[PDB]
Paper text:
Cyclic GMP–AMP synthase ([name]) is a cytosolic DNA sensor that produces the second messenger cG[2′–5′]pA[3′–5′]p (2′3′-[name]) and controls activation of innate immunity in mammalian cells. Here we show that [name]-like receptors (cGLRs) are innate immune sensors that are capable of recognizing divergent molecular patterns and catalysing synthesis of distinct nucleotide second messenger signals. In support of this conclusion, Hartmann, Imler, Cai and colleagues have identified cGLR2 as a second functional cGLR in Drosophila and have demonstrated in vivo that cGLR1 and cGLR2 have discrete roles in Drosophila immunity. Together, our results define cGLRs as receptors in animal cells that are capable of detecting diverse pathogen-associated molecular patterns and dictating response to the foreign environment.
To define the function of [name]-like enzymes in animals, we screened predicted [name] homologues for suitability in structural analysis and determined a 2.4 Å crystal structure of the human protein MB21D2 (hMB21D2; encoded by C3orf59) and a 1.6 Å crystal structure of a protein from the beetle species [name] (GenBank XP_969398.1). Despite divergence in the primary sequence, the hMB21D2 and [name] XP_969398.1 structures each reveal close homology to human [name] with a shared bi-lobed architecture, a caged nucleotidyltransferase core, a Gly-[Gly/Ser] activation loop and a putative catalytic triad. A conserved groove is present in both the hMB21D2 and the [name] XP_969398.1 structures, but is notably distinguished by the absence of a Zn-ribbon and the insertion of a C-terminal α-helix in hMB21D2. In contrast to hMB21D2, the surface of [name] XP_969398.1 shares highly conserved basic residues with human [name] and we therefore tested this enzyme with candidate DNA and RNA ligands. We observed that [name] XP_969398.1 is activated to synthesize a nucleotide product upon recognition of double-stranded RNA ([name]).
Residue numbers in the entry: 3 to 229, 232 to 391
The structure:
Amino acid sequence: ENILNDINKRFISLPEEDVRGNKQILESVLRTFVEQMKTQDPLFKALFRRVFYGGSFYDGLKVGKPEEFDLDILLHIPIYAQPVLNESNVPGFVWLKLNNLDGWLRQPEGRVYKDFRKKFLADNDFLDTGKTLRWMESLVQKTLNTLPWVNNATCELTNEFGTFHINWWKGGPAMTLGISHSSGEKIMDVDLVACFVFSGDKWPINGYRSNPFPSTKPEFFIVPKKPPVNPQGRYWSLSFQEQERVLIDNKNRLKPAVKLIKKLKEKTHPNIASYYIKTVFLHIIEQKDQSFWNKSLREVFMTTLREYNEFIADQSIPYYWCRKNNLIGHLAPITLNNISNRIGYIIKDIENNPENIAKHLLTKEEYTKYIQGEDVMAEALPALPAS
Ligand SMILES: [Mn+2]
């Protein structure tokens, strides 16, 4: 009863000591950068509340060597300006307008918000995703220029863990910081995502699931990821990732089971996004008694794999927070039929033969190292590099 845990340790999960050490380094580099950002823009300093570290690495759900995560930079509009969040005509997306920005500007603390409308708002004082992204990109560029550069446009930052190199580029809506040890070893990429955070009173009700932790996780935020829709720039995504992280925590077999299924997905059906698997497990959490997660890893894996296949076969994975959004509604029936048939064959092949699981989860090259006793995760990303 250790086959699945052994596969996970040797071929799936970064050792937790290295997870923790890389997080301490990365979080310190980013605090230095965000503190410098505050020196470059009083409006950013006024808006800034906190950061949220987003992605599978920080959820404990990353398969293999971690490569990137999102720095969700949470900005807060003063409630005196009367922000109003409305559920949009596209399930899962919202609009945000301000009903009293002028009254806030007439307050003493509103002085630093003199350019907020110009920088962030479209017609009728709607928060605009494109304007927000352009504002953050400009601020990041301004900040990068004030840092010491070595080599060719490589920033050098120091902290209690040593000296680090920051490279940057824009491959999407948000700037990416590539963070490396000064000795050359790459650590991780970080996307700098400008978000707006709200208190529990603003939680959407029209077609949305209620907050499971309104006392201890009261806040949620909106993310400038658009769904063609009109009006352009008004549609914001909701992030309930802070609540999702609590839902998946303290559940023993759950995170190994998710990663085993994600490993299977990477090998046999990359057509399915990782968040769709995460979403299936949110539904399973809601359906199952809490004791389910204390069963054997084999039983949790086999049972959730079967239920995952039923979602795929049904061709519907409802967005956990707004059920009218089918996360796989855009995938073709033929594709989903083939993937469900694939998974059904795998279930039959491993049903009564747990020694066949590794044959389906691992590439042939990984399987050879598996049989030979190798551990490819032990040194996948040492927080203290060998140099
Ligand atoms: Mn339940």
